[PDB]
């Protein structure tokens, strides 16, 4: 690895995601190839998330990519926000078609007409559907793999309930899943909160969110969102039903929508990556343990070259037996030192070294990718020891990133202190009146004092400090409603 994370981070990132074989550049801007090492992490995330929503009654399905201009517009507020980023199909071959059709940037307006068709009684609610698919949002701002791409993969869940309590409860369940994905799987700590009025989802009443902190570039980033759409879409799309116990009067369904994307893998890379390359939390790596024959003195023995391979495979088969995702790298075209480096660049949690000298003592070497720490392990304790190290690595990664968060998110009560803290490369919980104007102000202001301006991240469900009765927002003007998390951002 050439660049250093601490110097040219954009160079460091572009190298780590290519030399770990995660990404490959396309000939169309802001479009990126997910090579298997990357796609496997997504599949791990998908495997977790999918089994969870299934438990909540959600079912998978698949809706068309194309949305007609009529349907796209039915919720004027929603379509306003997405309209410029929407790509439009115009011709098939040479035939310009009888209409411009839109590629989904999101699927509210593809799915919701059909929700109307499907809801005819109170019996037909709830409706809970999720789909894994690609969407397109065409922004010309300079793109970055995973973090900011023109096409990307995600899931989107869309639910519809008779009541609002039901819908309410789903929003927070989903956001807890998303929090788990970040914290249990990717070993990344997040802050759960509510988006501000400025920031919330176009259409719908409230947006909850989880935010993570990329200490390297000092910015924070949004990991996943869970929206309460209320009746906003319900009324534009005619998703209606007769309440049985309040007859004659028509009802509108309450609606949620929620999403998580491949940006997860980018956040994973930025938080955990080394000057030595990628590092993978055991819960998501394609391979957790790589077995490497080493100490082979070129031209020595062929009966021994065979006993060595046999030992490597004894290990693999035993690790497979206790559900460790293990690969034995037995290739003879590459040096042991080359293999050591290859799998380090790729971030495999544990490198397992088998050499003749070690075999003689009926034993081997386990090497942790996070700390670089070597441990000699007895051959008969191989399963239990490697389990324990993997899970210790999962823990270590998360606590390191935890403590990193805890010292880069601090409360600052005045616009003076909030500007110095924000410039030290941090994120801050300020007292905030909650107004759209005041928020637009802080953005311009913080970009003037000391090269972008801070944004609202979220209003933390569990904020650092209890906001005191006599408390002014950092604009002076209005008093403060709630401690609100602010910082520079992706």
Ligand X SMILES: Nc1ncnc2c1ncn2[C@@H]1O[C@H](CO)[C@@H](O)[C@H]1O
Which one among 58, 433, 454, 485 touches Zn ion, defined by CB under 5 A? 433
Which one among 145, 193, 203, 224 touches ligand X, defined by CB under 6 A? 224
Task: Identify residues 324-363 at the interface with a second copy (CB under 8 A).
Answer: 333
What pairs with residue 228 in β-bridges? 206, 256
Task: Identify residues 113-152 at the interface with ligand X (CB under 6 A).
Answer: 148-149, 152
Q: Least distance to Zn ion from the beta carbon of 432, Å?
A: 6
Identify what 484 binds: Zn ion, ligand X, ligand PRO, none; CB under 5 to 8 Å per kind: none
Q: How many C-beta atoms surround the C-beta of residue 242 within 10 A?
A: 13
Q: Least distance to Zn ion from the beta carbon of 436, Å?
A: 10
Give yes or no for a cis peptide into 191 (omega within 30° of 0): no
Identify what 84 binds: Zn ion, a second copy, ligand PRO, none; CB under 5 to 8 Å per kind: a second copy
Which one among 109, 225, 251, 269 touches ligand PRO, defined by CB under 6 A? 225
CB 208 within 8 A of CB 171: yes
Q: How many C-beta atoms surround the C-beta of residue 166 within 10 A?
A: 15
C-alpha distances out from residue 180 to 9, 48, 166, 223, Å = 27, 10, 21, 11
- Six-digit token pair at 140? 């010309």
Q: How far apart are CA 125 and CA 339, in angstroms?
A: 56
Mapped onto helix, strand or coil, the DSSP state of residue 255 is strand
Q: How far apart are CA 4 and CA 6, in angstroms?
A: 5
- Please tell me whether residue 123 binds a second copy under the rule CB under 8 A: yes
What pairs with residue 487 in β-bridges? 427, 455
- Please tell me whether residue 56 binds a second copy under the rule CB under 8 A: no
Q: Which stretch binds ligand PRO (CB under 6 A): 38-46, 52-60, 103-111, 136-144?
A: 103-111
- Please tell me whether residue 257 binds ligand X under the rule CB under 6 A: no
Which one among 218, 259, 277, 460 touches ligand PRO, defined by CB under 6 A? 259
> In terms of Cα–Cα distance, which of 127, 107, 120 is closest to 62?
107
Q: How many C-beta atoms surround the C-beta of residue 483 within 10 A?
A: 21
Phi, psi (rounded to 5 degrees) for 435: -90, 145
What is the binding site for a second copy (CB under 8 A)? Answer: 24, 26-28, 31-36, 38-40, 43, 59-68, 70-71, 83-95, 97, 100-101, 103, 110, 113-114, 117-118, 123, 129, 133-134, 136, 138, 151, 153, 333
What is the binding site for ligand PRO (CB under 6 A)? Answer: 106-108, 156, 201, 225, 227, 257-259
Residues comprising the binding site?
A: 106-108, 137, 139, 148-149, 222, 225, 227, 261, 263, 433, 438, 473, 475
């Amino acid at each position: 690895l050439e660049a250093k994370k601490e110097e040219n981070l954009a160079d460091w990132y572009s190298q780590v995601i290519t030399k770990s074989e995660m990404i490959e550049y396309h000939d169309i801007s802001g479009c990126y190839i997910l090579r298997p090492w990357a796609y496997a992490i997504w599949e791990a995330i998908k495997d977790f998330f999918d089994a969870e929503i299934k438990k909540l009654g959600v079912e998978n399905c698949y809706f068309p990519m194309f949305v007609s201009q009529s349907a796209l517009e039915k919720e004027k507020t929603h379509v306003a926000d997405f309209a410029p980023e929407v790509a439009w199909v115009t011709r098939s071959g040479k035939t310009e078609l009888a209409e411009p059709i839109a590629i989904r940037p999101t699927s509210e307006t593809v799915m919701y007409p059909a929700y109307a068709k499907w809801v005819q009684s109170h019996r037909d609610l709830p409706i809970k559907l999720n789909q894994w698919c690609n969407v397109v949002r065409w922004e010309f701002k300079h793109p970055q793999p995973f973090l900011r791409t023109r096409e990307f993969l995600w899931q989107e869940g869309h639910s519809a309930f008779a009541t609002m309590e039901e819908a309410a409860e789903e929003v927070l369940q989903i956001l807890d899943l998303y929090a788990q994905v970040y914290e249990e799987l990717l070993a990344i700590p997040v802050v759960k909160g509510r988006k501000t009025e400025k920031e919330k989802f176009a259409g719908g009443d409230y947006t909850t969110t989880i935010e993570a902190f990329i200490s390297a570039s000092g910015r924070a980033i949004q990991g996943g969102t869970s929206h309460h759409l209320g009746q906003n879409f319900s009324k534009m799309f005619e998703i209606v039903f007769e309440d049985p116990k309040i007859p004659g009067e028509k009802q509108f369904a309450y609606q949620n929508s929620w999403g998580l994307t491949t940006r997860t893998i980018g956040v994973m890379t930025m938080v955990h990556g080394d000057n030595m390359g990628l590092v993978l939390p055991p819960r998501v790596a394609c391979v957790q343990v790589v077995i490497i024959p080493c100490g082979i003195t070129n031209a020595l023995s062929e009966e021994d070259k065979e006993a060595l391979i046999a030992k490597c495979n004894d290990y693999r088969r035993r690790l497979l037996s206790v559900n460790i995702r293990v690969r034995a790298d037995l290739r003879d075209n590459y040096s042991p030192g080359w293999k050591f480096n290859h799998w380090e660049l790729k971030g495999v949690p544990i490198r397992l070294e088998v050499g003749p000298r070690d075999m003689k003592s009926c034993q081997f070497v386990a090497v942790r990718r996070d700390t670089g720490e070597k441990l000699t392990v007895a051959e008969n304790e191989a399963e239990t020891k490697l389990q324990a190290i993997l899970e210790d690595i999962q823990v270590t990664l998360f606590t390191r990133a935890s403590e990193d968060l805890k010292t880069h998110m601090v409360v600052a009560n005045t616009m003076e202190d909030f500007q110095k803290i924000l410039d030290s490369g941090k994120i801050v919980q300020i007292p905030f009146c909650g107004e759209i104007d005041c928020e637009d102000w802080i953005k311009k202001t913080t970009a003037r004092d000391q090269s972008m301006g801070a944004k609202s991240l979220c209003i933390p469900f569990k904020p650092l400090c209890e906001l005191q009765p006599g408390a002014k927002c950092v604009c002076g003007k209005n008093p403060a409603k709630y401690y609100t998390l602010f910082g520079r951002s992706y």
